[PDB]
Amino acid sequence: NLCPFGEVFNATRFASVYAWNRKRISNCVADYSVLYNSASFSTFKCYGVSPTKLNDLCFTNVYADSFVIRGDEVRQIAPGQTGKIADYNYKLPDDFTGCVIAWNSNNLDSKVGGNYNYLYRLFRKSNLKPFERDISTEIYQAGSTPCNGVEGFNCYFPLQSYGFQPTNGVGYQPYRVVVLSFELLHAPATVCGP
Amino acid sequence: QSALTQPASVSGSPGQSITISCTGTSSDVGSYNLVSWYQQHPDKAPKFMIYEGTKRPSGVSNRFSGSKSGNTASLTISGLQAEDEADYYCCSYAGNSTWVFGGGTKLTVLRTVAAPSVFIFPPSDEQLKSGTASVVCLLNNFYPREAKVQWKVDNALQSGNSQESVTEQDSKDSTYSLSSTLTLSKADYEKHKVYACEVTHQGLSSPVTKSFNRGEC
Amino acid sequence: QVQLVQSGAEVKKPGASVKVSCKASGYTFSSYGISWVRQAPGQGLEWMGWISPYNGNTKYPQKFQGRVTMTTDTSTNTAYMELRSLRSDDTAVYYCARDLELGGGFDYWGQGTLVTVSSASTKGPSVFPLAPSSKSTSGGTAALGCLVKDYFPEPVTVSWNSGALTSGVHTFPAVLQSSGLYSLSSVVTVPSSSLGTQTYICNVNHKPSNTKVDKKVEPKS
Ligand SMILES: *[C@@H]1O[C@H](CO)[C@@H](O[C@@H]2O[C@H](CO)[C@@H](O)[C@H](O)[C@H]2NC(C)=O)[C@H](O)[C@H]1NC(C)=O
Ligand SMILES: *[C@@H]1O[C@H](CO)[C@@H](O)[C@H](O)[C@H]1NC(C)=O
Ligand code: NA
């Protein structure tokens, strides 16, 4: 009867942002005060709900979205943001109701000589809809001529890797992000915080 | 980014079929079906002939075919004709936004032996005024290309003051032509009387000579 | 129909720069790419780089990285290529070609621009007649020609009767004389019955010196 937030926050590896993970949270009780109490989090913003006094509300569903981005891009995990992350990788709706939790993970997700395992989408024909996930790897036609599955010239492979080196400035260091969405559907509410 | 290896020259009889090889590495010819072929006639821009290895742009004859096997592309010309005499270049994508050409292949059409028609030209009076005499010997329409031209002035073999030029194979008759120019000073030119071109060619029963006497219309 | 018209052949001193123009027409300029391909005399073709008139993207091979710059005027429909620090193995003919990009082909080519890298002066040709012989030299056929001599910057265009006479014409490759000047001959075989009735004029153009010479070739006295 206890919500499995440890599985998400204290997770060995995180997903690349373009292939962000989503964990369905239900049938459990959660202390968002115990979460807030962790001093690890460099970012803890909430939208439409007060962080404190969250253990009194009950939501039908709770989603825990998690991924890794550049430190400079944490600003983009917010309603109404623009940039490569919000436009092409992870998009929040304007009426987002939930919290955005982020923390520096240079100690875990940086490797000497570069960690290129973490990717992000750099090109897309259009912007993502809110909470849309695009793992396609079609070649992006930036020019007027077709590509036919080859990268050259105005044709680009759409994914690019972060160069996560431990020497990077804080703006180019890896950050782990957890986004909590609170769905209040007209169904049995199964996540509370007594 | 290293050149593609084509045979320097390919020859074939008329109506035959010949093939031009184009070899690269795995990183270019092997990786992409992006081989194109170009045909360059003498003194002209190349012509787009093949693309994607085997396709023909609308306008190219159907006897130009494309083939590919491993790291080697191949152009095949069938029903060979005189108009097919040209230089052929292959081109391949090499990755990294880089195109890379081949060394080029000269296509020669084999034909029957043709003896040359020999003509000899004395220098124009206009040129003598300026102090130099150019004597020109024309060897016209001959197959094969091998020929010997000799200058003999008052029956003495001249050496070291003549230059030759050869046309590429002609696009209608499959023959070559050759000019030989003998340059003398105006003073040397008038020291002598008989200027003679002597031509040796496989098509001639025995060498042909054409001559003139200086100062005789 | 598709067309690419390039700038005229020119001489450049070693170390100078040259900008070759390439005017496109008959198609949407930005719907394709522009590649430049050069050809040293008697040598193979060399890809020099690409430019997209769409977004201005360029790519050059490592060999020419730094020394070449490709630009595109989307209003004039004209592609320019510029090559600095000109050396003597940069003497070549320079083609612009419409580029299918990853379509995989150079569709249509321009006529080319012969860039000669040389410190020598631009000198014009002297044209001399190769006169038809008094004897009917061969069967019913006679030969006549023009000798184009002493012109430093190649190329030279020769036509016969302003294009009316193309059959049996042979213009030889220029030869470099010891003087450092070029020389060539253009010849044509015509029927012997026509020497008195028909006039024969060779039209020699040396655009590097803007000299135009027409020479009547007729039998001597
Ligand atoms: C995630 O891992 C952290 C790091 O160990 C855990 O933090 C501990 O939490 C307990 C319970 O509050 C404290 O008594 C310890 O002092 C904490 N350890 C450190 C090193 O600070 C945390 O419990 C784990 N779970 C979650 C949900 O964060
Ligand atoms: C492009 O060039 C880089 C740099 O040397 C090389 O590592 C890579 O293999 C090349 N890519 C292709 C597709 O040839
Ligand atoms: Na060749």
XYZ file of C-alpha atoms and ligand atoms in Angstrom:
675
model
C 0.000 0.000 0.000
C 3.013 2.260 -0.636
C 3.792 4.026 -3.924
C 6.962 2.747 -5.703
C 8.701 6.079 -6.276
C 12.076 4.514 -5.479
C 11.898 2.466 -8.680
C 11.766 5.714 -10.655
C 13.984 8.212 -8.851
C 16.610 5.763 -7.588
C 16.852 4.023 -10.951
C 20.132 2.624 -12.225
C 19.916 3.970 -15.773
C 17.558 6.607 -17.120
C 16.130 6.842 -20.614
C 17.293 9.083 -23.405
C 14.912 12.022 -23.525
C 13.505 11.245 -26.984
C 12.623 7.763 -25.719
C 11.443 8.985 -22.320
C 10.105 6.328 -19.968
C 6.662 6.452 -18.367
C 5.657 4.531 -15.233
C 1.972 4.117 -14.392
C 1.397 4.753 -10.677
C -1.774 3.417 -9.077
C -3.218 1.526 -6.103
C -0.867 3.015 -3.531
C -0.325 5.816 -1.021
C 2.447 8.356 -1.582
C 4.103 10.930 0.677
C 5.080 13.855 -1.532
C 6.546 15.372 1.639
C 9.106 12.547 1.905
C 9.936 13.258 -1.743
C 10.221 17.030 -1.222
C 12.383 16.398 1.855
C 15.234 15.031 -0.277
C 17.803 17.816 -0.662
C 19.129 16.152 -3.845
C 16.682 17.952 -6.134
C 18.009 21.097 -7.817
C 14.584 21.632 -9.391
C 11.203 21.029 -7.778
C 8.443 23.063 -9.437
C 4.759 22.163 -9.296
C 1.887 23.333 -11.477
C -1.780 23.520 -10.528
C -1.066 21.864 -7.162
C 0.676 23.003 -4.018
C 3.694 20.739 -3.312
C 2.997 20.835 0.391
C -0.591 19.731 1.000
C -0.388 17.124 -1.758
C -0.915 14.247 0.703
C -4.533 15.406 1.141
C -5.663 15.100 -2.492
C -6.563 11.907 -4.344
C -5.928 11.412 -8.059
C -7.254 8.713 -10.380
C -3.889 8.138 -12.042
C -0.288 9.244 -11.597
C 2.362 9.148 -14.317
C 6.109 9.243 -13.636
C 8.035 10.297 -16.746
C 11.818 10.108 -16.498
C 14.751 10.927 -18.791
C 18.131 12.686 -18.973
C 18.895 16.082 -20.551
C 21.530 18.804 -20.489
C 21.495 21.020 -17.424
C 20.748 24.093 -19.530
C 17.599 22.364 -20.842
C 15.867 21.734 -17.489
C 14.213 25.126 -18.053
C 12.410 23.494 -21.001
C 10.556 20.862 -18.949
C 7.766 23.357 -18.199
C 4.475 24.445 -19.819
C 4.855 26.813 -22.745
C 8.601 26.381 -23.251
C 10.397 26.277 -26.594
C 13.628 24.657 -27.727
C 14.949 21.358 -29.002
C 13.697 19.415 -25.964
C 10.182 20.837 -25.600
C 9.639 20.955 -29.363
C 11.143 17.621 -30.453
C 11.610 15.358 -27.411
C 9.297 15.935 -24.429
C 6.342 18.333 -24.407
C 4.093 19.364 -21.494
C 0.568 20.720 -22.028
C -0.342 24.276 -21.114
C -2.761 23.061 -18.413
C -0.189 20.638 -16.963
C -1.111 19.607 -13.416
C 1.888 18.076 -11.684
C 5.496 18.540 -10.646
C 8.880 18.656 -12.387
C 11.783 17.229 -10.368
C 15.378 17.433 -11.598
C 18.845 16.923 -10.152
C 22.454 16.983 -11.324
C 23.638 13.480 -12.251
C 27.205 14.216 -13.371
C 28.490 11.583 -10.946
C 26.313 8.862 -12.513
C 25.798 9.714 -16.193
C 29.223 11.127 -17.146
C 32.160 8.985 -18.268
C 35.764 9.983 -18.903
C 36.287 10.330 -22.633
C 32.568 10.958 -23.145
C 29.260 9.167 -22.579
C 27.341 9.177 -25.866
C 24.638 6.709 -24.788
C 22.194 9.551 -24.054
C 20.536 10.952 -27.184
C 18.018 13.628 -28.126
C 16.085 14.366 -31.298
C 17.540 17.327 -33.194
C 15.264 17.443 -36.263
C 11.549 16.881 -36.782
C 8.995 17.794 -39.444
C 6.704 19.218 -36.753
C 6.529 19.802 -33.016
C 5.458 17.159 -30.537
C 1.974 17.164 -29.132
C 1.885 17.128 -25.309
C 3.083 13.784 -23.891
C 3.895 12.414 -27.355
C 6.840 10.035 -27.762
C 8.675 9.732 -31.094
C 11.345 7.027 -31.354
C 11.471 7.090 -35.169
C 14.891 7.213 -36.826
C 13.932 8.212 -40.366
C 16.420 10.486 -42.085
C 15.278 14.096 -41.815
C 15.040 15.980 -45.112
C 16.185 19.522 -44.337
C 16.500 20.394 -48.039
C 14.479 20.166 -51.235
C 15.751 16.786 -52.452
C 14.874 13.286 -51.184
C 17.179 11.299 -48.912
C 16.239 7.630 -49.471
C 17.625 6.432 -46.147
C 21.042 8.075 -46.580
C 22.603 10.885 -44.625
C 24.432 13.463 -46.575
C 24.208 17.049 -47.516
C 20.812 18.384 -46.475
C 19.809 14.956 -45.202
C 20.409 14.378 -41.496
C 20.114 11.501 -39.084
C 17.626 12.969 -36.582
C 19.213 11.832 -33.301
C 22.294 13.341 -31.664
C 24.222 12.276 -28.575
C 25.110 14.428 -25.613
C 28.842 14.504 -25.023
C 28.642 13.842 -21.284
C 32.196 14.433 -20.103
C 32.771 14.903 -16.338
C 34.733 18.118 -17.101
C 31.702 19.790 -18.711
C 30.336 23.048 -17.403
C 27.197 22.738 -15.322
C 25.037 23.827 -18.263
C 26.297 20.878 -20.333
C 26.204 18.306 -17.521
C 23.627 15.484 -17.378
C 20.510 16.025 -15.293
C 17.984 13.383 -14.324
C 14.362 14.499 -14.571
C 11.169 13.015 -13.153
C 7.824 14.503 -14.189
C 4.714 13.602 -12.191
C 1.344 14.028 -13.904
C -1.813 13.861 -11.787
C -4.854 12.605 -13.694
C -8.203 13.371 -12.054
C -10.514 11.291 -14.222
C -14.097 10.504 -13.198
C -12.981 7.041 -12.069
C -11.996 5.477 -8.710
C -9.145 7.608 -7.392
C -6.417 5.157 -6.412
C -3.410 7.329 -5.431
C -3.735 9.262 -2.154
C -1.431 10.405 0.625
C -3.225 10.066 4.058
C 38.143 10.062 -50.601
C 40.522 7.992 -52.720
C 40.003 7.836 -56.475
C 37.936 5.056 -58.056
C 39.822 2.686 -60.336
C 38.571 2.334 -63.920
C 40.554 0.774 -66.782
C 42.411 3.503 -68.647
C 41.066 2.292 -71.992
C 38.488 -0.116 -73.409
C 38.041 -1.136 -77.042
C 35.414 -3.140 -78.887
C 34.298 -4.006 -82.391
C 31.155 -2.377 -83.829
C 27.924 -4.053 -82.798
C 29.727 -5.763 -79.900
C 29.215 -5.269 -76.175
C 31.894 -3.928 -73.834
C 31.961 -3.276 -70.099
C 33.746 -0.596 -68.072
C 34.759 -1.497 -64.522
C 34.596 0.901 -61.566
C 36.068 -0.309 -58.268
C 36.029 1.379 -54.860
C 35.985 0.341 -51.267
C 33.265 -0.891 -48.997
C 32.800 2.645 -47.765
C 31.621 4.018 -51.129
C 30.596 1.676 -53.952
C 29.728 -1.028 -51.429
C 27.662 1.125 -49.077
C 25.320 3.106 -51.343
C 23.382 2.385 -54.531
C 24.462 5.833 -55.702
C 26.740 5.121 -58.672
C 26.326 7.393 -61.694
C 27.975 7.282 -65.116
C 29.002 10.182 -67.340
C 30.014 10.294 -71.008
C 32.456 12.974 -72.189
C 33.077 13.527 -75.868
C 36.241 15.452 -76.831
C 36.088 19.164 -75.952
C 32.609 18.911 -74.390
C 31.053 18.831 -70.941
C 30.208 15.362 -69.571
C 26.750 13.886 -70.126
C 24.638 12.268 -67.406
C 24.067 8.646 -68.475
C 23.346 6.329 -65.508
C 22.162 6.871 -61.940
C 21.359 4.687 -58.925
C 23.658 2.151 -60.531
C 21.235 0.929 -63.183
C 18.693 3.633 -64.108
C 18.734 5.738 -67.287
C 17.664 9.401 -67.423
C 15.034 9.870 -70.122
C 17.047 10.453 -73.287
C 19.785 7.837 -72.891
C 19.854 4.843 -75.236
C 18.669 1.486 -73.900
C 21.973 -0.248 -74.718
C 23.632 1.596 -71.822
C 23.090 -0.758 -68.883
C 24.242 -0.625 -65.275
C 25.619 -3.460 -63.157
C 27.029 -3.796 -59.655
C 28.732 -6.648 -57.804
C 30.314 -6.159 -54.399
C 32.685 -3.196 -54.531
C 32.679 -2.846 -58.350
C 30.148 -1.018 -60.502
C 29.941 -1.720 -64.218
C 28.761 0.186 -67.280
C 27.815 -1.984 -70.261
C 27.437 -0.548 -73.764
C 25.711 -2.891 -76.206
C 25.307 -2.564 -79.957
C 28.517 -0.531 -79.947
C 28.671 2.344 -82.434
C 31.050 5.126 -83.440
C 29.130 7.760 -81.450
C 30.019 5.833 -78.271
C 33.685 6.860 -78.560
C 34.226 9.061 -75.512
C 35.650 9.102 -72.004
C 33.437 7.460 -69.380
C 33.574 8.387 -65.695
C 31.864 6.681 -62.775
C 30.918 8.454 -59.560
C 29.937 7.159 -56.129
C 28.830 8.540 -52.806
C 31.552 8.038 -50.206
C 29.774 9.058 -47.031
C 30.122 12.337 -45.261
C 28.591 14.445 -47.959
C 31.330 13.464 -50.377
C 31.208 12.516 -54.004
C 34.167 10.757 -55.590
C 34.865 10.131 -59.278
C 36.721 7.434 -61.165
C 39.898 7.698 -63.190
C 38.001 7.608 -66.472
C 38.007 5.122 -69.330
C 38.653 5.906 -72.995
C 36.389 3.885 -75.292
C 37.883 3.048 -78.695
C 35.771 1.616 -81.510
C 37.659 -0.981 -83.521
C 37.238 -0.687 -87.282
C 38.917 -1.761 -90.499
C 42.331 -0.502 -91.531
C 42.100 2.847 -93.321
C 45.053 4.379 -95.133
C 45.550 8.136 -94.738
C 45.177 10.774 -97.403
C 48.356 12.850 -97.245
C 48.469 16.578 -97.995
C 51.390 18.981 -97.652
C 51.088 22.749 -97.243
C 53.866 25.310 -97.796
C 53.945 28.402 -95.563
C 51.684 31.291 -96.495
C 53.408 34.325 -97.995
C 51.917 36.351 -95.132
C 53.885 34.282 -92.613
C 57.224 34.508 -94.453
C 57.049 38.313 -94.220
C 57.279 38.008 -90.419
C 60.376 35.781 -90.564
C 59.120 32.252 -89.806
C 58.107 29.390 -92.109
C 55.676 26.718 -90.898
C 55.306 23.659 -93.149
C 52.262 21.509 -92.398
C 51.658 17.870 -93.350
C 48.137 16.493 -92.941
C 47.441 12.776 -92.532
C 43.722 12.357 -92.892
C 41.217 9.706 -91.928
C 43.353 6.746 -90.968
C 43.032 3.578 -88.896
C 44.879 2.439 -86.847
C 46.399 5.368 -84.962
C 49.994 4.336 -85.337
C 51.727 6.320 -88.072
C 55.189 7.597 -88.962
C 55.727 11.055 -90.457
C 59.165 12.137 -91.664
C 60.366 15.444 -93.070
C 62.988 15.404 -95.824
C 64.424 18.685 -97.099
C 66.455 18.407 -100.313
C 66.351 14.657 -99.569
C 67.931 15.091 -96.113
C 65.998 13.710 -93.134
C 65.130 16.551 -90.740
C 64.970 15.815 -87.015
C 64.068 17.883 -83.975
C 62.123 20.777 -85.538
C 58.688 19.210 -86.013
C 55.684 18.620 -83.759
C 52.622 16.412 -84.200
C 48.996 16.612 -83.115
C 46.390 13.844 -83.314
C 42.621 14.126 -83.172
C 40.583 11.775 -81.050
C 38.593 9.060 -82.792
C 35.994 10.559 -85.119
C 32.369 10.137 -84.056
C 31.103 9.064 -87.497
C 33.988 7.166 -89.289
C 36.084 5.831 -86.378
C 39.320 7.256 -87.857
C 42.064 9.575 -86.626
C 43.823 12.537 -88.207
C 47.322 13.865 -87.628
C 49.050 17.173 -88.335
C 52.834 17.488 -88.521
C 54.273 21.009 -88.472
C 57.866 21.753 -89.507
C 59.051 25.151 -88.262
C 62.026 26.879 -89.890
C 63.310 30.415 -89.894
C 62.638 32.370 -93.081
C 66.391 32.274 -93.763
C 66.589 28.483 -93.397
C 63.419 28.000 -95.448
C 64.937 29.713 -98.499
C 68.218 27.770 -98.286
C 66.362 24.731 -99.642
C 64.120 23.721 -102.533
C 62.267 20.404 -102.080
C 60.162 19.961 -98.941
C 58.821 16.437 -98.549
C 56.441 14.676 -96.176
C 56.897 10.906 -95.934
C 54.122 8.862 -94.328
C 54.276 5.256 -93.098
C 51.037 3.513 -92.134
C 49.741 -0.057 -91.877
C 47.135 0.700 -94.546
C 49.681 1.784 -97.165
C 51.298 -0.773 -99.460
C 54.499 1.277 -99.174
C 55.191 4.736 -97.701
C 53.595 7.758 -99.382
C 55.481 10.984 -100.097
C 54.014 14.421 -100.806
C 56.347 17.243 -101.787
C 56.558 20.742 -103.239
C 59.270 23.008 -104.615
C 59.649 26.298 -102.766
C 58.434 29.220 -104.850
C 56.232 27.287 -107.275
C 52.498 28.037 -107.458
C 14.696 23.501 -70.754
C 17.513 23.245 -68.223
C 20.512 25.505 -68.822
C 23.716 26.470 -66.990
C 25.841 29.242 -68.529
C 29.293 29.874 -67.047
C 31.704 32.796 -67.190
C 34.457 33.088 -69.769
C 37.881 31.486 -69.720
C 40.510 33.665 -68.062
C 44.156 33.801 -67.018
C 45.169 34.285 -63.397
C 48.623 34.945 -62.004
C 49.820 32.429 -59.385
C 48.478 33.314 -55.952
C 45.505 35.324 -57.231
C 41.818 34.431 -56.936
C 39.134 33.647 -59.508
C 35.336 33.717 -59.268
C 33.459 31.628 -61.843
C 29.814 32.501 -62.426
C 27.156 29.911 -63.247
C 23.707 31.075 -64.366
C 20.833 28.590 -64.129
C 17.522 28.704 -65.990
C 14.714 26.383 -67.004
C 14.136 24.875 -63.555
C 13.524 25.871 -59.951
C 16.964 26.947 -58.718
C 16.542 25.738 -55.129
C 14.906 22.405 -56.039
C 18.387 20.970 -56.702
C 21.976 21.436 -55.606
C 24.987 22.907 -57.383
C 28.193 20.889 -57.513
C 31.424 22.117 -59.064
C 33.673 19.629 -60.870
C 37.033 20.505 -62.398
C 39.209 18.773 -64.981
C 42.918 19.371 -65.473
C 43.978 19.073 -69.142
C 43.908 15.426 -70.148
C 43.001 14.393 -66.591
C 39.941 12.987 -64.858
C 37.116 14.813 -63.144
C 37.446 16.016 -59.544
C 34.514 16.823 -57.287
C 35.133 20.186 -55.665
C 32.109 20.628 -53.420
C 28.387 21.282 -53.134
C 26.076 24.174 -52.302
C 22.336 24.210 -51.706
C 20.596 27.292 -53.150
C 17.771 26.275 -50.793
C 19.408 26.969 -47.419
C 22.947 27.991 -48.382
C 24.445 24.786 -46.984
C 27.873 23.927 -48.381
C 30.312 21.041 -48.278
C 33.878 20.864 -49.571
C 36.251 17.885 -49.601
C 39.253 18.136 -47.300
C 41.563 18.843 -50.255
C 39.863 22.157 -51.056
C 38.839 22.978 -47.470
C 39.855 26.574 -46.832
C 40.712 27.510 -50.419
C 37.301 27.324 -52.099
C 34.125 29.280 -51.359
C 30.768 28.615 -53.031
C 27.971 31.197 -52.864
C 24.477 31.447 -54.338
C 22.464 34.508 -55.421
C 18.881 33.241 -55.195
C 17.657 36.382 -57.017
C 19.966 36.212 -60.061
C 19.693 32.381 -60.116
C 23.490 32.340 -60.232
C 26.032 30.129 -58.471
C 29.532 31.490 -57.878
C 32.642 29.508 -57.024
C 35.840 31.220 -55.859
C 39.282 29.628 -55.458
C 42.135 31.509 -53.782
C 45.901 30.876 -53.568
C 45.886 29.719 -57.175
C 48.691 27.323 -58.071
C 49.712 25.861 -61.434
C 47.967 22.517 -60.908
C 44.780 24.553 -60.493
C 44.825 25.105 -64.262
C 41.739 23.187 -65.384
C 38.247 23.449 -66.830
C 35.685 24.239 -64.122
C 32.165 22.826 -64.491
C 29.110 23.710 -62.468
C 26.452 21.015 -62.556
C 22.903 20.722 -61.282
C 23.094 18.289 -58.371
C 20.414 15.739 -57.495
C 22.099 15.567 -54.039
C 21.174 12.171 -52.573
C 19.152 11.547 -55.724
C 22.551 10.462 -57.012
C 23.494 12.360 -60.134
C 24.829 15.518 -61.752
C 21.892 16.159 -64.092
C 22.974 18.897 -66.499
C 26.405 20.489 -66.840
C 27.567 23.951 -67.780
C 29.859 24.447 -70.749
C 32.841 24.916 -68.435
C 35.375 27.631 -67.642
C 39.037 27.051 -68.522
C 41.124 28.711 -65.800
C 44.799 28.944 -66.764
C 47.197 29.727 -63.909
C 50.190 31.376 -65.566
C 52.426 34.415 -65.207
C 52.719 34.675 -69.005
C 51.099 37.496 -70.942
C 47.896 37.152 -72.956
C 48.841 37.087 -76.632
C 46.673 36.777 -79.659
C 46.787 34.306 -82.498
C 48.114 34.974 -85.943
C 46.137 33.102 -88.560
C 47.788 31.816 -91.677
C 46.331 29.989 -94.646
C 46.977 26.340 -95.483
C 46.239 26.589 -99.175
C 44.685 24.012 -101.402
C 47.110 22.486 -103.876
C 47.202 23.245 -107.540
C 47.228 19.525 -108.165
C 44.017 17.717 -107.349
C 45.694 16.053 -104.465
C 43.529 13.040 -103.695
C 40.873 11.560 -105.918
C 38.164 14.161 -106.069
C 38.970 15.585 -102.683
C 41.028 18.575 -101.734
C 42.274 19.811 -98.395
C 42.530 23.237 -96.987
C 43.169 24.709 -93.613
C 43.998 27.473 -91.227
C 47.072 27.603 -89.064
C 46.533 29.371 -85.785
C 49.839 30.279 -84.311
C 51.419 31.982 -81.343
C 48.638 32.533 -78.799
C 49.453 32.046 -75.135
C 46.146 31.524 -73.329
C 44.232 28.522 -74.522
C 41.408 28.056 -75.705
C 40.755 28.836 -79.386
C 37.497 28.201 -81.250
C 37.569 27.716 -85.028
C 34.506 27.366 -87.256
C 34.222 27.007 -91.030
C 31.788 29.229 -92.955
C 30.251 30.451 -89.670
C 28.970 26.954 -88.932
C 27.747 26.164 -92.452
C 30.689 23.774 -92.937
C 30.920 21.017 -90.324
C 31.453 17.911 -92.482
C 35.026 16.674 -92.815
C 36.347 19.322 -90.418
C 39.258 18.444 -88.133
C 40.662 20.924 -85.613
C 43.729 19.561 -83.886
C 44.600 19.889 -80.196
C 46.821 22.870 -79.522
C 50.530 22.151 -79.152
C 52.749 24.056 -76.744
C 55.652 25.461 -78.731
C 59.079 26.146 -77.252
C 58.175 29.853 -77.255
C 55.563 29.106 -74.601
C 52.853 29.981 -77.136
C 50.173 27.618 -78.379
C 49.655 26.534 -81.977
C 47.068 24.442 -83.793
C 45.595 23.801 -87.225
C 42.026 23.294 -88.394
C 41.559 21.487 -91.702
C 38.617 20.477 -93.880
C 38.359 18.242 -96.938
C 36.039 19.563 -99.652
C 35.271 18.356 -103.190
C 37.808 19.547 -105.750
C 35.078 20.850 -108.081
C 34.169 23.493 -105.470
C 37.469 25.374 -105.124
C 36.633 27.977 -107.767
C 32.890 28.185 -107.135
C 32.565 28.171 -103.321
C 34.304 30.420 -100.795
C 35.878 28.954 -97.643
C 36.377 31.067 -94.509
C 37.724 29.919 -91.143
C 36.376 31.852 -88.157
C 38.971 31.972 -85.367
C 37.969 33.325 -81.948
C 40.403 33.880 -79.071
C 38.083 35.191 -76.365
C 40.955 35.764 -73.849
C 42.207 38.504 -76.214
C 38.784 39.310 -77.772
C 40.357 38.936 -81.222
C 38.048 37.735 -84.002
C 39.719 36.806 -87.293
C 38.070 35.594 -90.489
C 40.481 34.239 -93.102
C 39.506 33.379 -96.654
C 41.349 30.244 -97.769
C 41.724 30.026 -101.540
C 44.259 28.471 -103.929
C 47.434 30.401 -104.628
C 48.281 32.031 -107.979
C 16.897 6.852 -2.771
O 18.247 6.799 -2.385
C 18.566 7.726 -1.339
C 20.073 7.724 -1.191
O 20.526 6.675 -0.347
C 17.815 7.340 -0.067
O 18.125 8.313 0.926
C 18.072 7.793 2.265
O 16.747 7.903 2.803
C 16.601 7.430 4.149
C 15.130 7.516 4.488
O 14.693 8.867 4.572
C 17.477 8.271 5.068
O 17.357 7.803 6.408
C 18.926 8.182 4.609
O 19.730 9.041 5.408
C 19.063 8.578 3.138
N 20.427 8.362 2.678
C 21.250 9.348 2.306
C 22.620 8.924 1.860
O 20.907 10.524 2.328
C 16.313 7.306 -0.344
O 15.605 6.755 0.763
C 16.006 6.453 -1.583
N 14.591 6.515 -1.924
C 13.964 7.608 -2.380
C 12.500 7.446 -2.673
O 14.544 8.676 -2.550
C 33.113 10.354 -42.203
O 34.420 10.797 -41.857
C 34.707 10.522 -40.479
C 35.978 11.265 -40.120
O 37.152 10.539 -40.462
C 34.798 9.011 -40.282
O 35.053 8.718 -38.911
C 33.496 8.343 -40.710
O 33.684 6.933 -40.742
C 33.035 8.818 -42.096
N 31.678 8.358 -42.364
C 31.319 7.673 -43.458
C 29.873 7.281 -43.545
O 32.121 7.384 -44.337
Na 41.783 9.492 -69.818
